[model samples]
Target chain A: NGIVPDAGHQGPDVSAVNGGTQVINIVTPNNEGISHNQYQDFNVGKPGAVFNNALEAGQSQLAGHLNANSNLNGQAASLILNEVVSRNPSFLLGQSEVFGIAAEYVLSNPNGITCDGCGFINTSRSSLVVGNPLFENGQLKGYSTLNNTNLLSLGKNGLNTTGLLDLIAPRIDSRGKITAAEISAFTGQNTFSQHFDILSSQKPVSALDSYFFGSMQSGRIRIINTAEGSGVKL
Target chain B: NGIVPDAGHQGPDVSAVNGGTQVINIVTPNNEGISHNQYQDFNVGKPGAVFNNALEAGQSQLAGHLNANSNLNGQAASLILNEVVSRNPSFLLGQSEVFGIAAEYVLSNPNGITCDGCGFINTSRSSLVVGNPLFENGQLKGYSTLNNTNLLSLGKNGLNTTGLLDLIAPRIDSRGKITAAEISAFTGQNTFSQHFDILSSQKPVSALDSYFFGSMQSGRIRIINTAEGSGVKL
Candidate 1:
């Protein structure tokens, strides 16, 4: 349920397709970014807390409170099979690591991921932190225990961070086919204190192009063409 | 009975849990590349002929064969729904043209990909050519199809060709993350004859590195590598 829709939009009720009514469920330990060995949103609580509480449908007050929908379903935050899985997952995208500790659960489960054997640490009394905090290290890590496999970790060494099928949002079309990757020269400007005409409302919707999120030193990166990012309002 | 494993290597039979096997299948109109509408290793069943065959897997063979695998009830291609999705996917990873049409089939088919309204030329009557043939153009245009969401055509502009996952093989642990990207500046060589070895067999399996296939303007290639390649073995 917490798996929010992408690009600030929910195109359709994925589960309701074919005239059906079901939940497009997703799972998580929680959060998008963090800095902690516990992985519960930088001291949100202990790793096993919420998981333990929701481990059993009604056995814990925590479950009744946090998992009001009873959707957590004892989903193991440690394994993707339970947490990240569902009868209806429009998409399963989003992971971590005790490194190998969690992977062992996957590998040994040769039968494939299962919601069975999902164990959690007690969160009955773990202190909870409240606040929308950002990672001091700029490393984005959080809530990827249930549906891993394609799980990736950033800042493992390189102090940088980042996902896939390709989307930045509501406005982008299927193949961001670069129709006009213009030369780095921009004489026209628009925004806070300007107006431009090169880009116009009538410029066919298909007329979308990208300028690499490259150098403040424009004209710097070339036929070495792309990656990491592309786009400079300039 | 269900969920066929990816690639040539069938790692494990993915079926258990609820205790049954359904289908976890995918389909397409087809094509990685071609001189025109034909696709093949070349001189094989014309590309048009092949796509034509698989295409019908849509119309009737589909109504019969596919409707059978209707078992395609549900398939999980990792989490394109959750993460690479919640946002969007840009060709940031690599490639041009529409990669989306391929994705749409995966995303929209709640009951799995149906050959329902689909159609392909008849490979049924096309002669199957033998021996390894390569694309005349270096574009990696292989395997894809119908609905045309984001059908990317390569080598059309002419550059190179490629596509293949790192492979979730039987013994590959963690998809070999590249570490030391080596360095080599060459001048006097073409069509083979060179020696070098920063990468050796004893180089611990963990010492993963990447050797992108680059060309110095010569013959088409294969089983190549930069890290383990660039050799003098003519």
Candidate 2:
């Protein structure tokens, strides 16, 4: 019998042991500038910030990673999206504190894959699954709640069971952990979830380290699933 | 007492030999391509050609004699003219077998001078003592001309005569030449006869050279009588 892990009180963690082809970790700036705090506080509906702030933030993080490790520079959020699409991954995982930025990245990088909640989220959960119940009634529940209330709630009406649990009891794991079994299970279900990670407090590592660097806050996209992915990092 | 010899043929020759401070010989190419031929034969009435031809011949001949021993090469005409003007010579002489070229040179040269004719026949002459003959009442008579005409007639125009007999058939020597003493005698009594040769030569030399050089010829200019009788040829 398969153990159905409870919809536990998991915040948005980058240590999602998921599989498919590749995993992308997006890191936003800390709550310092408008670019960072706006997205953190309001997700997509932040004042003075566009709706695609989350995707922009994610892409910036990715571009920053490439820049730090290699000779790459400039914002490549759109370029990274195109790369993910060409890869045609079954699943994509983006972990960042900003939900608007992650939603933008998912929308930009479909990769011939369906995203749960359209990969839009309000929390930074480490162990996220593809069908983590972030979408309800064909709409992203997090975005709806943020747009309607201007306040982020974990267990909104459309939010999933894990989301509800998070609302009741918020859990924080300093040394984020991931199990290989979790990665295997996730990949078995979703082909793009192959590049799994556990989002440890330590900086994320990946096979693409020669071409990319992961921030201490977020990891790198381990596998570029397509030609578009190659251009993204470059 | 000074004797004045009989003047030669009282035509152009007498007038020229006795009339000028300078004589310029000009030559220019005729329409028939000949030099020193009759101007009428070559139709010498062309606008610039008539004057230009006359002036060039006069100046060229004048320059030639002034720099007689020097090879003028037709280029030193202006230089010689300048030198003559600087020295302020009492008489100038020019000779040319061509008229048009000589006339052109004179006009172009920046000297306050004009060419009446090329000096083929001594038509352009000037004198410090006796100016050009103003043909008054159809007579070639001037106070200076009386003695000059008389001396030129006996072929003693450039000589000196000192006795009364010198004025009458001024004793011709074994060579049948009236002595210079006889002519000098006449000029000593009056310096006008002494200057006759230059004045007489000027106009006729210019007109005749212009005609003879077939309406046109090229030549140089020369000044005669330098430093009390020492003449420098240009």
Candidate 3:
């Protein structure tokens, strides 16, 4: 028996690459292989040079500080974290730059939701989280970066350390080489390890010590204090 | 068989007129006997005096020409006629005076018609006879002075002849006296007659005669002409 053609058959073809291979199949292009749109060409000319210069300047400055110190104090850590987010691959690609643009859309639309520090990832789906975790924590003590689940977590080392030497990150392509496809596949675990490797090699002593230093130092000190107080007194 | 006296019949005689045999039948003094209403008294005093004075003045000036052997040549007559009419008593008394105060009443009502001239002797019952006689023929010319019917006839002879004198009737008062009422009435008729008379008399006289006699003499001749033609011819 032959299947009858339905109304959906009249629309433009959007079948899976393998041709009706699976139910609810979507045919999305591989970001690594697909040619960027014309707007992305902005990455090539004077604007490209500007982006490159900005990245190199940022990385070098951050690397130098990380080599000099083992951790960043509250204010210094905030400054570096902000800088990273500002130059994040997605932001550079113009995925989300406006502060409240996503919030406004989510509030006005029926099915829209946003992840804080990220942005509206779906307008017809409600599986989303929003709001700053660092703010939820009631202090700038441990929160450092926003991950996929839109959860805010601790930085390298806790607060109360200072200087530019605390920064550490991948040197792969500060020009935002990571595309949306790569981000979609990202698991928060080990995702930042790549950055740690690049940063550690560039300035082993400074970078190695400071990368995750603030959090590590705070944890170790708390353990030492607990041990010292717990010992039997003579 | 003798008649019994009835109580009803014994009442006082209402028709006795106070028991006097000589019942004078004195009719109450009625407003009807008064020829004119007090309201009609206009107080336009001494009519004939003015007319007479004016007439005298005219006559004095024209006497030179009117004299039989003077160079006047009757030329002054027209002037005299004009003066007579212009100073006529009725004209001074107003048209209403002629009808209400002077002319005899042929009818009486709050708003009844009255004659302002000799011709309307029996104006009652709408039968008005107006205008003067053509003294030339001793015959009535026009009647019914209502609506100025006889006015033209009154002045007709004056417009048609020269070098003659006409006698007019005397005026009578409410009391039958020939006072100013007479003067006024005479002046009214004379004035009207003289006006046309002058016009009639002067119209035909040669300019040469007028020039030689001057206006006074010429005017006199004109008046005389009207008088004569009007049947006062002598």
Candidate 4:
């Protein structure tokens, strides 16, 4: 069993950081971390920012507020990495109204993740990686495992995205329809490596064997899985 | 059986109406009928507008856009009556993200109404009336029956409204958890009338018999039903 339980894992301390334009934002749990939902005034950069320690429980628009003023019309980036630097697991047990993200959106956590009736509104590519994100030059490069068993569970409402949905964790168990234009599940250290520019949709696959894993098709979607020993137990 | 089929019920013609600041907007189906989702520039009046023939089939932000530009801070009214002037039944099978309405919100349709896995983001008071709306002097008066019986159905993802959720139809059938602060179901034309000012929440229930119906309680909410032969069958 590659799944590590969330008992002794420690997250990063989110006690020292402020300001909006920084590429990484360590904020409290509210809809106004990056922008106000009423004004649409974004504080993140064009390449997007990484938000740490924001866990939204119940019906929340935390991510929806950030996508509001994030320059959807202009050439700004919608790539937001929700890094769970808090001391608890991310419990998106209800509808997270994160509408209008035309680019990449990633929710990375190492403790654990659970979605009971969660739905998303992200457009292009969405990822749920179960590890601490590794960034270089303020850009997402890869992940670093915490040696903790990362369990990803989805309820009957399932997980759906209109674009690509990637799940990289130690263990994933879903009881609903995991719908997306393209869905990929990988095991961690989360060796789901991406050689191309992670933000470019038209970037060619740099190496086929480095990325292409076992895949299946559900209706019109392409479901790719590269993990063998322990991946998603669908 | 007061449930009416959606066959010959003629809705109002939606061929002639334009401009933004009108009290009533009869326009095509898009998120830009009342306002743009990008800018919070509202097109309807402060008392809100009665939109006719705007049926959102897919995952639409039609009502969400209206509620966006809508004044949630000032004393502007959020009493939007989404009148279904289309000949078909209003199919709210997906999540209708009509968030940020701090006032009354109503959805009226006489052809019949159905909600399969539908979720809402409306605040204050939310109503699903099974009849054509009756407006007087640029204000919502009530509803008028269409001779045909109206049916309301809900799937396993039952209707949930945080504020007062009112369901007025000829017949209602539900198979999920209907949660609300105050849930009220009544037979319409079907005379579940209201004499108080439809726009004012503090206008004192004017007359109790004019609005009060039969009732029950589900923990923190008060469920009211004032129909005899055919109301809601939960």
Worst 10 residues of 2 chain A by lDDT: A164-173
Q: What value does the lDDT take at residue B143 in candidate 4?
A: 66
Can you give the lDDT of residue B186 in candidate 3? 15
Ranking by lDDT: 4, 2, 1, 3
Q: Give lDDT tens digits, candidate 2, residues B1-234.
A: 001112222101101112222222222222322122111111111011211223222343322222221122233222111111111111112222222232111110111122222123221321112111222354222222222211112111221112111111111111112211111111111222222332321111111100001100011111122112111110
Q: Report the number of backbone clashes for model 4.
A: 2
> Which model, 2 or 4, shows the larger DockQ?
4
Evaluation by DockQ, superior candidate among 1 and 2: 1
lDDT of 2 by residue, A1-234 (tens): 000111222111112222311212332222221111101111111111112233223333212211121111222222111111122223222222222322222221121222122122332222232222223443232211111111111111121111111110011111111111111111111122112222111111221111111111111111111111111110
Q: What is the i-RMS of every prediction?
A: 15.8, 49.8, 81.2, 22.3
Q: Which ten residues in a row have the lowest lDDT in candidate 3 chain B?
A: B208-217
lDDT of 3 by residue, B1-234 (tens): 001111231111111112211101111112222111111211111111011111112221111111121212222111111101111112111111111111122111111112222221111111111222121242212211111211211211111111121212211111111101111111112222211221111121211110001001111111111111121100
* Listed models, DockQ each: 0.01, 0.00, 0.00, 0.01
lDDT agreement of model 3 with the native: 0.15
lDDT of each: 0.18, 0.18, 0.15, 0.41
TM-score of chain B of each: 0.17, 0.17, 0.16, 0.55
- C-alpha TM-score for every candidate: 0.17, 0.13, 0.11, 0.31
Strongest candidate by lDDT: 4
Docking class of 4: incorrect
In model 3, which regions exceed 4 Å deviation? Answer: A1-234, B1-73, B76-173, B179-234
